Design a protein around this ligand. Structure first.
Ligand SMILES: CCCCCCCCCCCCCCCC(=O)O
Ligand SMILES: CCCCCCCCCCCCCCCC(=O)O
Ligand SMILES: [Ca+2]
Ligand SMILES: [Ca+2]
Ligand SMILES: [Ca+2]
Lengths: 124, 124
């Protein structure tokens, strides 16, 4: 669920304020998105939207309010490393992996502060 | 989900092997159930079935394979005390409370070993 993703982020990058650092970044970090991502980081968010979009399309998955962010799964953090629990059901595991691949990805992308709070109507 | 319930049980009663102690007990501990529970313990399990039956009937909840046992929620154990996380969604929170009320209930019921492995075709 959203709060678990925020803290996976805090797991893979210990110095971070997830909301402050990665919400309203680029074209895809923050609600919906448009155009083409502006850097690797943004690209990470676009992939994440896509991943969620995919998960909505496993016809076996019916998320509360149609939002995969409402879905809690099980995971743990140990020394910067994220592990999704295998006992997550198929839908939970999909979401869990989306979030995981995205905290890892964020952790590897260069952070460009020009790109936080982007003029999207114009650059996206 | 099932594994989380087993370990809530292990939370509220530290000496226990959940499967060995409370599966195949009475009329209601262990798959489905019939007749009238045989003691407070069994009654605890019947309530739990009912609770799950209720949760299946919140028309907003669509469990994987129709089984609320597949649904992971978030919780923690601290000194015998169980806490369901408020950030569980409405469906997750319902299940979480079913499991919680049942580990607590088991923890308070007298354990009658005559009743483990009951002849159900006959006493249930
Ligand atoms: C990757 C975006 C930021 C990461 C951590 C804080 C924001 C969460 C993820 C972005 C999704 C949009 C925010 C969710 C709020 C909502 O439920 O609409
Ligand atoms: C209260 C029953 C026992 C508690 C701990 C071990 C058994 C779990 C709960 C009983 C439900 C039946 C077992 C679930 C197995 C299944 O998925 O069919
Ligand atoms: Ca987005
Ligand atoms: Ca869940
Ligand atoms: Ca039962």
């Amino acid at each position: 669920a959203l709060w678990q993703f925020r803290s996976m982020i805090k797991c893979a990058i210990p110095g971070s304020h997830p909301l402050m650092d990665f919400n309203n970044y680029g074209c895809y970090c923050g609600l919906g998105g448009s155009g083409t991502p502006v850097d690797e980081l943004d690209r990470c968010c676009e992939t994440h939207d896509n991943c969620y979009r995919d998960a909505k399309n496993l016809d076996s998955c019916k998320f509360l309010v149609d939002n995969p962010y409402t879905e809690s799964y099980s995971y743990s953090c140990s020394n910067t490393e994220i592990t999704c629990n295998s006992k997550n059901n198929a839908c939970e595991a999909f979401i869990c992996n989306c979030d995981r691949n995205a905290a890892i990805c964020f952790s590897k992308a260069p952070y460009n502060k020009e790109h936080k709070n982007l003029d999207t109507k114009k650059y996206c």
